[PDB]
């Protein structure tokens, strides 16, 4: 999973390096071809069949990169689904928490033993569910489970007192229950809430960065087809005028430097995705 993610971005970075090396080699060949200012047909049909090779390989590399990007998106979606499940479990635990608090209020406001017993029954069911509602060997996790064990034990004590008609002892047991709950489960609750908020923020920023990365790839792909169109609108037409030629000679330089700006942006985005993922 995480190791697979690290391997993907690693190999995506490697593909990026290969496509920037191929581009700079093509630029060097074009420069060395057109410094001499040779209008021979053989050199054009060969030193631009150099552009043809670069585009054939670079396009295959782009296809591999697109497949890797789709796999990366699938893994990110799996991570987001795991975070969604954890948030749902946290919501269930908070619901059980609210049930416990409501029934503690009811016990405080109660006057007879039947109301106390009913509230304690609801508390016991909520505490059992909350203990089970957890996604895992951290010390806080163990303290949470042990605290719910003690909490259900205190519910047992309060129920035992209530079944004997001792309402005041039941309220006292509920107060000790509140103290135990605060001392044991509150820290885990705070940690889970903080983790869920941080994960929501991370999800938002990763949705933004992935969108930017997909846009960068599609933009680079659009530049590549423009490169082929320009080369053969100039290749097959066997152009001869030097002014028409020079103009193209710059068009491609500006297109190549724009592709550089795009490729370095892709590199920095991939480095960002790695840092945020570890």
């Amino acid at each position, epitope marked *: 999973d995480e190791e697979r993610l690290k391997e993907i971005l690693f190999f995506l970075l490697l593909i990026i390096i290969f496509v920037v090396f191929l581009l700079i080699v093509d630029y060097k060949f074009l420069e060395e071809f057109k410094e001499k200012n040779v209008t021979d047909k053989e050199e054009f049909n060969e030193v631009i069949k150099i552009d043809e090779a670069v585009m054939l390989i670079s396009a295959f590399l782009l296809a591999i990169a697109a497949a890797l990007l789709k796999e990366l998106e699938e893994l990110i979606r799996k991570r987001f689904e795991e975070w969604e499940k954890e948030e749902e479990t946290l919501k269930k635990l908070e619901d059980n928490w609210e049930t416990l608090n409501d029934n503690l209020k009811v016990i405080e406001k109660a006057d007879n033993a039947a109301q106390v017993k009913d509230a304690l029954t609801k508390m016991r*069911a909520a505490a059992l569910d909350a203990q089970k509602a957890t996604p895992p060997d951290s010390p806080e996790m163990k303290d949470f489970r042990h605290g719910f064990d003690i909490l259900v034990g205190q519910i047992d004590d309060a129920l035992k007192l209530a079944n004997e008609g001792k309402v005041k002892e039941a309220q006292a047991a509920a107060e000790q229950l509140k103290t135990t709950r605060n001392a044991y489960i509150q820290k885990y609750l705070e940690k889970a809430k903080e983790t869920m908020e941080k994960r929501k923020e991370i999800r938002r920023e990763l949705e933004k960065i992935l969108g930017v990365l997909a846009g960068l790839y599609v933009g680079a792909a659009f530049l590549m087809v423009i490169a082929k169109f320009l080369t053969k609108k100039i290749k097959e037409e066997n152009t001869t005028d030097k002014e028409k030629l020079n103009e193209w000679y710059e068009f491609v330089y500006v297109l190549l430097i724009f592709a550089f700006f795009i490729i370095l942006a892709i590199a920095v985005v991939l480095l960002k995705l790695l840092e945020i993922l570890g």
Partner: antibody
Amino acid sequence: SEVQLVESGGGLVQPGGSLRLSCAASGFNVVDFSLHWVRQAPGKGLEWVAYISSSSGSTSYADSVKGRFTISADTSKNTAYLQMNSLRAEDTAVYYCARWGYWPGEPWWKAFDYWGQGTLVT
Amino acid sequence: DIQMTQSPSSLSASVGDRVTITCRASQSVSSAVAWYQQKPGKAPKLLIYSASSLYSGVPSRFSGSRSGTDFTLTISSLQPEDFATYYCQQYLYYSLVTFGQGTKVEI
């Protein structure tokens, strides 16, 4: 090395009478298991009658039988007793005695893992 | 007082037919629901506890599931020794024990 519960003392009795059912436990002691009495009327379903926790002395009763039955225990001889008083026509049933572990852990979650053979009361 | 409503009150099935028994709790009892099997003239024995945990020695065909206050017992392959009365029982607390009405699976 077999955990079992054996019921005794049940049988035919006149209405309004008194009898002490006994549940003797072997393979385990009472002090770490609450003992519950559960009755099944002829052709009906199961119904929980009472329980006793000898560790804390707590006893609880079904509403249909509260005030008439008295559940007690003797850990020295490892037995539970149910004194049935003021018997009526709806008290005829097969009475089973079951063990239930204490909170927390698997013993509590296993519920009535072992049941007695049950004795008939008429 | 927690009611534990069991359906159906009785079902007829043959050997191999999948059997499903459903129980509804009048209020949340967590997963503190157990399924017991009872033969005619014998004491109930524990099949499932914690509403999904299979007791030791029970064939793995028996299974239990929970969905809110609904609890389901499933016999995947009804064997000839699987005809009996099955009881859902909530055990939230010692004094709050209530049983289902019982489903009489017969061959």
